[PDB]
Design a protein around this nucleic acid. Structure first.
Ligand SMILES: [Mn+2]
Lengths: 97, 103, 93, 76, 97, 83, 105, 93
DNA sequence: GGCTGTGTTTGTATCAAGTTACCTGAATGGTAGGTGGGGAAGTCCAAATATTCCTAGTAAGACAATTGCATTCAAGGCCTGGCTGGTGAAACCTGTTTCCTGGGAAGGTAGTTAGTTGGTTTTCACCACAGGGAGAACCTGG
DNA sequence: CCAGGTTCTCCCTGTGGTGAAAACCAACTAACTACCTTCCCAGGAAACAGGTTTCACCAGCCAGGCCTTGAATGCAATTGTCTTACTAGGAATATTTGGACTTCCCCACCTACCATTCAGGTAACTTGATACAAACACAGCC
């Protein structure tokens, strides 16, 4: 059979709030970090724990951003986030001018 | 021994050295580092108290950073002290907004 | 070399407050960085308090005012009480 | 490259934040902001590593650069 | 004859963005500050310039708060502001009382 | 002398003019009281700090530099009063 | 050249800055050219701000500079606003700015 | 007593950049607090940079790295250029 | 088209810069000196690069059902202005309280040596929790 | 209410992370000494609260009214959900190679000190940018 849409989403919300593992795959993130790092200075090497620290910081930053985005979306009587919500949250925090 | 003489646990001589070798003033008077060590002892005692309670409520006996995260983010005053703090392997509280849940 | 930490003291405080609660290495590293963070905040604030009044000595009064500034209400009250008890216990000996 | 941030992966992060239903155009948005968040950190961290005249970014450089941002990280 | 709703507000917006005098009367603000000062410690004295500095800072705080509240209210397809907007803006700022 | 009933010293045209400077057109009637509450919270987290400096140097008079140091600690730097 | 600023061709007092760096307890000791470099940095920043301040001042037909012009020159630029986004200028005011949907038709 | 300020130097810089622009006292006080603020930021950051590498001397390199950290891009580039010119002009004399 | 506000010069008067003579104290200058910092070679630790493989996550394609969105209308809740009285504001005299300066005494605190005791390090047993698989049961669509 | 599907719990096996213990060694305390910021005491005076007056500008109140908000609704359409192929990351492992780190050794260089000096805070005299008043042109608004 089939589930109604939204039920297993709440199941997934409980599932991912319950556990505390990493969620972004490691090697694409590492290639992204090295690819950005090429432009500021060439010939750079990384301790792996530094790449882990960057992954932790990026994950926590995006999680807080999605929570505040969800609050903005619930304010306007909708249940689906939109890019103007992300822009609103980043404006009110004062990240982008 | 200064820590026994005050009846404390944090090493007074180490904190006194670290106030010397940190370039904070000209001279450090005594009576300061014992006061500071007592403050740190009280804070660590508070956090380990709440962490042990949260660990016991999940049928475990060692402390993982999930326990520390749930211990900090439940108490109000430690949450306001540590709002700018990211803990590795931490996670969040189980939090559900109201209008999400169906009928 | 030989790096300095606080883990043995964390063990002593833990066994004073709980008999049968273990602790992993990761939590120990987090508590070590936590202690270094709070000590850095209080020492910097005490330095600026000593510098503002043209004084050149850190005493217990500056740390008492710094702890009263940084920590919120109930924690500040209990911390001032604990530190006052510790100063009296050291001084009477 | 930048497409290594995968389309079902991002969903998982939004499911940790408690988002129930997501649009599509968030995806092309989300690769932007994350990229900008790296462009402030690494630019600082490299500036530490050239100061010590070394050629390898250690963990304390990332920790110091995040501390200057205000996103203080423990554990390391 | 009577003005229409819409024009007078724009005239006041242009005026009070043009000029930079103060907008809170000095004596009730002084009574309020001295009241709250008495609530902590008895028998405290103020230099007048410190009271002026407090008035400047609190005016700046309230103006910035209403700007962010206006952005939040315009986001929700409305023109009137409501206290939900202030509460949402103070949550997204992070200063949650 | 006891002191009470001064939070209504901030009046409706004053908050009206403040919202006019921010660029707000239409205001509900329920904003006003609410705004007062926010202001009160703000003054606590200045004055509670400020007098502590005045309590530290053993004084009875809160100067201007103490307010400037309190605001500098809160994260809102103020210029134009020294420091 | 008697003064050290004359030896470097600057305008800020290098001896004053060196005195402050020694008696601000920022280190154990201070190198030679460090207050020179720092005085150069301060002079460049001060000139960069006062130039745009004077331009915004003469754009309203006034001769002197009052803090409203400093406010307008700081906020109308971009780099200074990224630098000074946590500062309230006394007697400041805001930019003349109205949102788009507020203007009637 | 005798308080220390920077107003004469602000006059000199203003007359180098503009012949006929006056300045009130309030703007002078704002610029004085501004100079003290930036000097405090740079000195604190240079102190932490000297402390991080277990070094015990502030040189020009630490201030160059601090100015490269605090200021944004174009201002940092122009400031490093100006300071380098000033160091060379002082050293060759 | 009539009512209105913002802007364009004219002129004062005035209070707020600007200019100039003077008294201090912070800056400058040559010389020990020791000390912090640059260079040089090993070595050992530690990131980079090939390989394979196999598995678990990912890409894509259809399909409904649920949510976003434009419309429409009622009503209400907030803009507007006229007028009364009501309190802020400016000025001036008065007491008196706290701050700053100044001198003298002092207890506290750096500074050196000597003796020793607590703080690290390696290895060693073993128990709390991973894994799983099985049962049970609560949960959600039909 | 009924069928099935994911989730909670129980029990067995295994383990490697963790508490424990013996040996190593640099930090901690005690005792004595110079000396030095800091505590205490008294006064001059600047400033702060207090009060009063007279005015002058603005806050409250109440009625009119009309435009914003909000609930109900139909309709389009974008997104969750399920299934199938496929493809690239995780992990071990070996190779290798450049690089941080540490042991010694040599050289610039900042600090301290003291005699010399000039430029810079301070006060009195002088001019002038501008708020203010007031009349008139333009722009625009309904
Ligand atoms: Mn009271």
């Amino acid at each position: 059979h089939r589930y109604r849409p939204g039920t297993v989403a709440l199941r997934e919300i409980r599932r991912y709030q319950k556990s505390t593992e990493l969620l972004i795959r490691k090697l694409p993130f590492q290639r992204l970090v090295r690819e950005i790092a090429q432009d500021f200075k060439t010939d750079l090497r990384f301790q792996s724990a530094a790449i882990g620290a960057l992954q932790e910081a990026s994950e926590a930053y995006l999680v807080g951003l999605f929570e505040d985005t969800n609050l903005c979306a619930i304010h306007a009587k909708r249940v689906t986030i939109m890019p103007k919500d992300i822009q609103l949250a980043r404006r009110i925090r004062g990240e982008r001018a | 021994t200064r820590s026994s003489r005050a009846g404390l646990q944090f090493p007074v001589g180490r904190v006194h050295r670290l106030l010397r070798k940190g370039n904070y003033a000209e001279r450090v008077g005594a009576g300061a580092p014992v006061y500071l060590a007592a403050v740190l002892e009280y804070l660590t005692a508070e956090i380990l108290e709440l962490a042990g309670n949260a660990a016991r409520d999940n049928k475990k006996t060692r402390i993982i950073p999930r326990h520390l995260q749930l211990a900090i983010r439940n108490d109000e005053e430690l949450n306001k002290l540590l709002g700018k703090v990211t803990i590795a392997q931490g996670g969040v509280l189980p939090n559900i907004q109201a209008v999400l849940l169906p009928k | 070399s030989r790096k300095e930490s606080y883990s043995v003291y964390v063990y002593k405080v833990l066994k004073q407050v709980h008999p049968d609660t273990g602790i992993s290495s990761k939590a120990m590293g987090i508590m070590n960085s936590f202690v270094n963070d709070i000590f850095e905040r209080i020492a910097g604030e005490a330095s600026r308090l000593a510098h503002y009044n043209k004084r050149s000595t850190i005493t217990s009064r500056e740390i008492q005012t710094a702890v009263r500034l940084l920590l919120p209400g109930e924690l500040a009250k209990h911390a001032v009480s604990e530190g006052t008890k510790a100063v009296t216990k050291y001084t009477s000996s | 490259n930048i497409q290594g941030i995968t389309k079902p992966a991002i969903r998982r992060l939004a499911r940790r934040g408690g988002v129930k239903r997501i649009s599509g155009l968030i995806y092309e948005e989300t690769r932007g902001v994350l990229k900008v968040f790296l462009e402030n950190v690494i630019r600082d961290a490299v500036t530490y590593t050239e100061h010590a005249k070394r050629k390898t970014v250690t963990a304390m450089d990332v920790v110091y650069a995040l501390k200057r941002q205000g996103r203080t990280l423990y554990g390391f």
